[PDB]
Structures are given as C-alpha cells and as structure tokens.
Amino acid sequence: TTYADFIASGRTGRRNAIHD
Amino acid sequence: GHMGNAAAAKKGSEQESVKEFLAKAKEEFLKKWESPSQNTAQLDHFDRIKTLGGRVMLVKHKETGNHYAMKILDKQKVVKLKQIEHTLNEKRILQAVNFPFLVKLEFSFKDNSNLYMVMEYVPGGEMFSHLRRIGRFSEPHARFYAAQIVLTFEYLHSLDLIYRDLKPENLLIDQQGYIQVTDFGFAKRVKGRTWTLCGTPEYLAPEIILSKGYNKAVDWWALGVLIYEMAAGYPPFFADQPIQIYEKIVSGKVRFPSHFSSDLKDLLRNLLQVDLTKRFGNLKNGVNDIKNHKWFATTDWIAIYQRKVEAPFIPKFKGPGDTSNFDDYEEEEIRVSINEKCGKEFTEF
C-alpha cells in the first residue's frame, strides 16, 4: 500500500530543508 | 447562477473588505520594513532552560517570569554557509509583519559571537508531532488548519512575500488550538519571479525544481501538499531520496486515498496543478478560487481570523515552561567569544 511505501521510504521523520 | 442576490452581494462585500484590510496591512508593514526595530533586550535578561528544535531553546525572562523561544545563530557558521542575507532578512521580516497565525518576534539582540531572536513560546509543539501521533486528521480538522494557512498566505502575498517552507514541522499549535507559522528563513520579498532552489523536497512545486523562475504560486502548491499530508497522513510525492521525489513532482501524477472526499480531491487537483495557467491561487480570481471552493463551504473566514471558531484539538498545558509537547535534543552550552566576530556583516541585525 501507499502507506507501507511511505514507511519504507525512510522519510517519515522531520524533514530538512535544502538551499542550493 | 450559483448565488441568489443576497448571497452574491454578501460575498462581493466580503471580498471588498478583504481588499480594505490588506491595503491597511501593507501600509503598516512598509513602515516597519523601511525602519526596522533593533536591540530591544540583552542576554543576561534570560535564564536558559531547554532546546526545542540554527537552534531554538526555551528561556525565561528574569524580571517578568515569561517564557520565550530563543533562536540562536552562530555568526561564524552563518558566514560559512553563506547565510548572512537569510538571517538578516528573516529578522527584518519578523519585526515587520503582524498576523494572528504568525509567531511574533518579541526581542532581538546580538553580542560578540551570536545573533538572538526571542519569539513567543508556543508550548503545544509542532503539528508534525500531532499528525504523526494521530496518523491523519479528519477533513474538518485539516480544513480548520488549512483555512489559517490560506489567510496567512493571502496576507503575506499581499506584502509581496513568498514563504517557501510550508510543512507540518514549521506549524506550531498554540494553547487555543490555532496555528502559529514559524521559521521565515527562506521567505523573500519578490514582486515578480525568483529562482532559488530552496525549501523542503516533498513540498517543492515543479517550477522550483525546474530551471525556470517562479512566483508566489509555489506557496499554493505547497498548501496542496500540506492539505494532502494532513488528510492522508503522508505526502503526495515521496521516495527514498530527494532526486526521485523531484521526478514524481514534475510528473505531477497525484493519486488519492479512497477515503478522500470528492470535494477534497477536486481542490487538491487544482492546487497540485503543474500548469501555472490553471493552478488555483494563480488565476484572475486570485485567492477567491480557493476560499470559495466547495471544500471550504463551511468555513467562516472572518471567524477563523477572529479566533472565534472552536478548535478541534487543544494541546495539554502542563505548566508555564512545560516542554512535554516537544522532542528532546542534545544540549550545547551556548558559547560567547571575548572577541567580536563578523561585526561589519551583521550591522543591520
């Protein structure tokens, strides 16, 4: 499922910004 | 038509009152923008207490007992990361804006090593924590928060400010259950287009990723991402690594949980719209395409602004300087050098 894929993505915690 | 005489006149009047409000708000903003406040306190006025999330820590004002969230910036690191302009700009914005869903700058000052911004302490913690705990918000719950973001962006955009870092991590829940937007590190006053690749991967609009320039409509895309994540529990575009997230964003193929209402799906398809000639918030009717959308039909925009709507969730208030709504972070001592650092670069702070 999409939720399972979300868990597997490793991006369930706080997300950092970028600046390039 | 969709509206009888009474409803049409009421809506027309409401939209004209918005214009009147924003004209006054811009006049007030520009006075403070052009003559910013400076040096309204000093470090020995405060007790250090705990780190809440640059680094932000809880402090207590020694004379009033009031608690605040103090953002501490190391001048040397700021230079090393080419962040001088961002940190000056963030403070300049915070001291000039005024809106009920923006956390307020209460004091600012500097010393030989660091810059300090002392803001309102918002003890209910981040939306992020509450969302991950509950899984997903009901649509009425999500709508209550979304309406505050819509009004906040209507305000900011009228000032030619683009926010550029919407996400649950940057939204704090106050003691009345209302949103407080924090962190203006990537905000920029731009009247036309800008080009910087900045923000958080999941929330970037296609045109930020692509080399083309972009405008305030990237914030309305980000709102679509936020509403989707609030209602689903996960964002519409994710992957293991940012590069793959960008590929999905630029394709723009969005799929929805089966529990999303039809009204919600229609709104999100119009916010998460790759084509700028079609994206809500970017058309002739401006923000009204969003505010008048069926998903917001039950929203009393004035009552939200006046904070008269009952919130769906009130954080547990365990005391004046209680931190039980925040994560724990490693604690650093906050060092101040005997020698002034980078003085010329930070004169305006």
Q: Topology of this protein?
A:
The complex is a heterodimer of chains A (20) and B (349).
Chain A lengths: L1 H8 L8 E2 L1
Chain B lengths: L4 H30 L11 E6 L3 E7 L5 E8 H6 L3 H13 L8 E6 L3 E7 L6 H8 L4 H20 L2 E2 L8 E3 L5 E3 L6 E2 L8 E2 L6 H4 L7 H16 L9 H10 L10 H10 L16 H4 L9 H5 L44
Antiparallel strand pairs in B: 1-2, 2-3, 3-5, 4-5, 6-9, 7-8
Helix pairs in contact in B: 1-3, 5-7, 7-9
PDB class: transferase
Keywords: PKA, Kinase, Apoproteine, Inhibition, Cocrystal, 3x-Phosphorylated, Transferase, Ligand 02
Assembly: dimeric
Written account of the structure:
The complex is a heterodimer of chains A (20) and B (349). With 20 residues, chain A is an alpha+beta fold. Helices cover 40% and strands 10% of the residues of chain A. Chain A is elongated, with a radius of gyration of 11 Å. The N and C termini of chain A lie far apart (33 Å). Chain B is an alpha+beta fold. Chain B has 2 domains: 209 residues, Transferase(Phosphotransferase) domain 1 (Transferase(Phosphotransferase), domain 1, Orthogonal Bundle); 121 residues, Phosphorylase Kinase, domain 1, CATH 3.30.200. Chain B has 11 helices and 10 strands. Chain B has a 5-stranded antiparallel β-sheet. Chain B has a two-stranded antiparallel ribbon with strand order 6-9. In chain B, strands 7-8 form a two-stranded antiparallel ribbon. The radius of gyration of chain B is 21 Å and the shape is globular. The interface between A and B is medium-sized, with 15 and 23 residues. Strand 1 of chain A pairs antiparallel with strand 10 of chain B.
